[PDB]
């Protein structure tokens, strides 16, 4: 008839009575501590946009954080911890480089997220404090994905992760439709990032990088962002 | 209350005489959703109750090799590890011996894979149960695995969340299954899956994957509206 | 703190490793080694802590281990640690003298063992090597130097400094009575006895309860030269002659 | 390739390590203690520098000066290290003892075999020739003045450098 | 690599050392040459002891009772007998009892087997341990036979012919060392009679 | 609770031990950055004197490449390793790429080394932060910040270690294109931002001046004192 | 205060800067079998007390006084297992030194190397220090030598010392007794008498052991010799 | 380089392997297992890579305490003449390199 | 074909890839190894300069490039350069360290018109 201080939540190996590894879900809270990253896969490509949360007008907005390229068609949008993002960007990038140096083919988006969940899921001695968002248009066609602390991946059509993961995924739930164009995805990602962001969306406080079947993964410029976020 | 001291390692016993962190892994099955698995003399069916519509596509049923696949109820890192291991076992059986791998044997390989962790420090029990449905020379198979390193042979089973409802259905119609068709056996599996569901909810070709192997049939994962034709015939929750 | 004070990997709310600060405390409780960089050389005056009547000396120096021709060090702290650290100082110097055929410039050698001791904090399961060492040096770059190193790896360069017991006290006495640019090894050896005699209360620095080593340069060769019993007897009796002359003056 | 071989004689608390010049043969180690490394110049240089590393450390540790015999032991050790793929040299550790100042001369082959002689030795590729000449010129008890002549003569008979190692102050006689 | 380095034989010159070989050989040039025993060596057994013959000496030390002749390379005969000496001193120090000739033999054989007779130690290993007068024929390649008598090196054939002609199963000490001396005399250079009881 | 291991999260979602290495940064000595018109400057305070201490052996502005230099402001020995190893990796790049090495490149290395020390609790993250300025192949002025957590970040004006916010807030105002145009003005700016940091001027300041053409070349305390008196004459004018 | 956290772990320093597992391994030494090292003119004596004084014991088995090379031996107070493995090592390093420098290892050199084993075993975590201290004596360069290596691995030359039990009492008696010029005929008696101070029973060839260095080198005294020294004192 | 290069490189590997084979075949699976668990435990106790370490526990468990080889007495690694960076050496042992 | 003319301070040399402000290296032999090794060692002396605050003396750099060429030859069985280090030291004066195919050294007055002097390097 006495209260006990039992801890299953200090150890990532230790199961609760219910069977919960809390440290993985505490690293999900660390994804939520990071910055919102909205990707929208379409019929005509997949877009990734993401907030930079630039704080000062002394820090350089010209520099590119929060979004990366991995080959021609695939990159991902990082959200949670940039230090932890880096080591999984490197996996993706080197193993798809190796795919092009083995088969002379660029590795499918599902297979790049397989490779990344081999470098993850390996606790690095802690549940990876980053969620990436792998948006490529491979051999098969457009594809968005989502990675999490647990290390695994899962396939997406419209996903928002990070600061307002569910704040901005409920906007995607209303906004995204199957027959989205890549133009639509671009503008919708951005305008929902705008209504999430406590700051006002200009091209300096956002990274967008988008791929189509035709036009391979590039990083949306100051001017391209400016144009879309003038309209939206 | 006293179990306190002895519950927080997998490589310590209690005065009571039981490792509680293996029992907690066997509670972590239930944190994942209700997979059903039931077989006949021709086919071995699986079904999976998939917990957004845009996000989290949730691939519960997984294909291992031509003759074999699984459905997943619990920790998904572990689900992946275990499935990928089985793919390698069967690859190697068809690389060296140029045959399928027995389902019994492959579930035994998973058994010993999942015992190492529990009898090792710096390790935890794979926190997931599988429903491992292949077809051999033998005939069709279902093989429940538990998050604990022990495992079962089954002709029907459900594991996951509020999954006793399904288990009960699968006992009531256990006999039917042995002598069912592909699609008959499937509707039986789906009615177990629907017994698990609230009465306000339904299958509605939405929270239905179906993972069927059989005699000439290979393990094929019907999803989205490839499950519609099976659910055409199923009728009357009553 | 009661936490953050265990593994030497575990920071505090403040950002403090108390383990490494307790290795500094272990220097606190060691032989006073007082170094005074001079013009003519650079000396390494000391408290010869262990002076029991049955205790034997079959060595060249007590706390003062020499490194190559051109450098020597002292020891204040954990004795076993220091033994392996002073063997390592010789071996570092000799590897540079094997590759570049030069007697290691002084900063390099100090820094090398500081990297060793900085690993022995960084990596938890190791103990912070609880020694400070005062490196009298000559090199072709920076004439004569005095140095210190710490258990942390935190190292410095000095005109006069101390390690061990009444060390901050001794550095205060140096800051009173040191005159950078005027200080010949003569007047530095005078200051060295003075400051030892002033900081610790050992009869009248008993000559077997102090030791000096003078790293000088003679005919373009570096001369690491222990002061004889006779010669620190001369320095201390002359210090006491001046004390008595000044007692008559006052 | 200018291999060469280098003599050294036993004297009156003096030795005359006499070594050909036409690469560096003479390498000081202790007070009155040198080595005559002759053979391939590159392996000579390498193994002399490695020896000096090992030596300096021994010296720092012990407190004493290395005995020619202990130096010869390290030489053999560093050559036998390369039993398979040898250093192409034949050292001779020809000095007075730092304590006794007892004349002591001993050639090695390229995989060690240290071998000590109580008249003189020669070590290297040409060693045969001036060994013969030295024997013809050799005398028992060699004051360092006339010692010089015997050992230059023989070397040159087969412009060499005769380091006449001495109790009091080492002489050198480049020719 | 950033791996701590370890001790033993280093195999780094090897291929570059073989480039020296190739060049010098081709042009007609000399590289320093391996120094050898080239000794007649000998051994015998008699009633209650061993004698080891050699010519100038090849007879080296192992233990108070154990001695070991050297034919082959001089470097390597001396090296192996000195290292095996130290090994049997360590063995004896702990055991509490002077070390055995079976111990000497096993160790020598096994060491010379590891290094596959790229080291030239063709030794006649003679001691009188607790279990009595033992003689062996240690070879560079880590082979051996336990023989009443054996000769190796420079006129071994002539020496062995004398031995086998003028041997008796159980000798006296003086006739045993007489045999090893006249065997050395046949192969040849001072006779080197290391007698053991 | 979760501040007794480097490699644990919290319900609020934090590595507190990594933030305690950033509290060890915060207990620094004010290091200040500017990234001006074909100029970069790193003013950093000397903090303490100790009458009889050589200053050569204890300096806060270390140079990494021909066209990279930094100003560290946390722990000293930790930073010594980071800086030694930044030069190791600089040389690796330089040799292999055949490039005068990017600033960004080695800020990313310093970051990733600290990330390599963030991912064990049998190690500790270097509790130091560096303002790695400089130029590129072509000559673009740079300023960055690296963290114990092990992220790199790009900057124009910076202010870290002791009184970090104070001096960053000075630059929020006094960093402008008409205080940047010339190299005089950027030297003046860091000095005048350190005339917020620390009481003394031209006294406890140690100021690096790398240009598009030139390298770190530490200034004299007479040179800095001239510019302290120039901004004092500007204060006399205002 | 209790400050017990610091006194379990050997890798920690204490608030004041103490290494306390070292001190508790020196407490294992200071509950040891009384030994006395007296470096005399004509060699050293290592006269010690045997941890057996029994009717049931094989004299030929166990030795407190072990040689390392001819000219060196040593004696111990604290731990027998630990002692025995440390002297297996000592013998190795003497023979390694004689295969490298072909010089019978100096007493100082050997002492350094066996005290560098001691150094490692206080340094690292997940081991304990050795709970034994070593009076490593021996004869070199026409000179007697005695040292005293520790659990920590700190070693110091001695003219006269004692370790184990009533061992500060040992060194007190021995400060009053030992003369610089005292030669080894008289130092064996002095070491027997320093044991008498730190003894419990009646002293005999059984209940003590003695072993000495010399010009010649190191040995152990035969039961006969030990009882003859006890009869002469 | 030489045949013996690799025969000596993996000497200890391809001996204790043979010991475990013998014990498997005679005593049982348990006998290698037990020896292995002792060895690995006592060679989780040495200095950081960059200092030369005296591993008395592992040596005496092998029976090397009373046995010297050329391994010991050639190419003295304790006076190593080529050492790296302390931190980078430790990283290599950890497997961060 | 490398040229070595060491003077009072006047180390005129010709082929040619410089180490420091006031050091040249000449490298010929196995077209590739030549300039590879010159660049390699010219960046190793640069590392030493950037770290220590002072670059390698001609003497130190020559000792260093011999230890680096020695281990090159051991590893790669050609790894062939023939080398001068036409140097000048601030502490000493001029240098000209000729070096063989198997990594020897010889300060060799007889071993562009790059004068290697206190003032620097003067093609």
Tab-separated table of C-alpha atoms in Angstrom, chain C residues 36-44 65-73 93 96-97 101-110 134-147 158 185 213-225, chain F residues 56, chain I residues 54 89-92:
chain	number	residue	atom	x	y	z
C	36	UNK	CA	61.811	30.965	-11.772
C	37	UNK	CA	62.677	31.630	-15.477
C	38	UNK	CA	65.859	33.835	-15.442
C	39	UNK	CA	68.150	35.670	-17.974
C	40	UNK	CA	71.239	33.370	-17.680
C	41	UNK	CA	69.145	30.140	-17.418
C	42	UNK	CA	65.853	28.940	-15.808
C	43	UNK	CA	65.924	27.271	-12.326
C	44	UNK	CA	63.613	24.642	-10.693
C	65	UNK	CA	63.260	14.249	-14.168
C	66	UNK	CA	65.122	15.525	-17.310
C	67	UNK	CA	63.514	15.102	-20.767
C	68	UNK	CA	66.260	15.623	-23.423
C	69	UNK	CA	69.557	17.670	-23.426
C	70	UNK	CA	67.491	20.899	-23.804
C	71	UNK	CA	64.563	20.353	-21.292
C	72	UNK	CA	63.728	19.083	-17.755
C	73	UNK	CA	60.449	18.903	-15.683
C	93	UNK	CA	60.880	14.371	-27.119
C	96	UNK	CA	60.653	14.338	-32.618
C	97	UNK	CA	64.505	13.986	-32.323
C	101	UNK	CA	66.710	15.544	-35.657
C	102	UNK	CA	66.031	18.564	-33.345
C	103	UNK	CA	65.679	18.568	-29.490
C	104	UNK	CA	61.854	19.145	-29.165
C	105	UNK	CA	60.973	22.892	-28.882
C	106	UNK	CA	59.454	23.331	-25.390
C	107	UNK	CA	55.755	24.159	-26.156
C	108	UNK	CA	55.436	21.007	-28.382
C	109	UNK	CA	56.561	18.600	-25.583
C	110	UNK	CA	54.350	20.252	-22.869
C	134	UNK	CA	56.932	22.618	-14.151
C	135	UNK	CA	59.045	22.439	-17.387
C	136	UNK	CA	62.338	24.417	-17.339
C	137	UNK	CA	63.308	24.618	-21.065
C	138	UNK	CA	65.632	26.062	-23.712
C	139	UNK	CA	64.816	26.011	-27.489
C	140	UNK	CA	66.086	27.835	-30.658
C	141	UNK	CA	62.693	29.689	-31.000
C	142	UNK	CA	61.945	31.175	-27.512
C	143	UNK	CA	65.342	31.204	-25.665
C	144	UNK	CA	64.649	29.973	-22.059
C	145	UNK	CA	61.079	29.280	-20.724
C	146	UNK	CA	59.300	28.025	-17.584
C	147	UNK	CA	55.956	26.133	-18.168
C	158	UNK	CA	55.625	31.705	-16.818
C	185	UNK	CA	69.784	33.215	-12.601
C	213	UNK	CA	67.927	22.269	-11.035
C	214	UNK	CA	69.302	25.107	-13.287
C	215	UNK	CA	68.761	24.641	-17.083
C	216	UNK	CA	71.370	27.186	-18.406
C	217	UNK	CA	73.311	27.555	-21.743
C	218	UNK	CA	77.174	27.233	-21.714
C	219	UNK	CA	79.227	27.340	-25.006
C	220	UNK	CA	75.975	26.847	-27.028
C	221	UNK	CA	75.038	23.623	-25.120
C	222	UNK	CA	72.059	23.355	-22.660
C	223	UNK	CA	73.339	22.469	-19.115
C	224	UNK	CA	70.660	20.935	-16.762
C	225	UNK	CA	72.608	21.180	-13.451
F	56	UNK	CA	52.105	33.396	-26.259
I	54	UNK	CA	57.170	28.370	-37.091
I	89	UNK	CA	67.309	28.581	-42.218
I	90	UNK	CA	66.665	31.729	-40.058
I	91	UNK	CA	68.779	30.157	-37.219
I	92	UNK	CA	71.663	28.838	-39.446
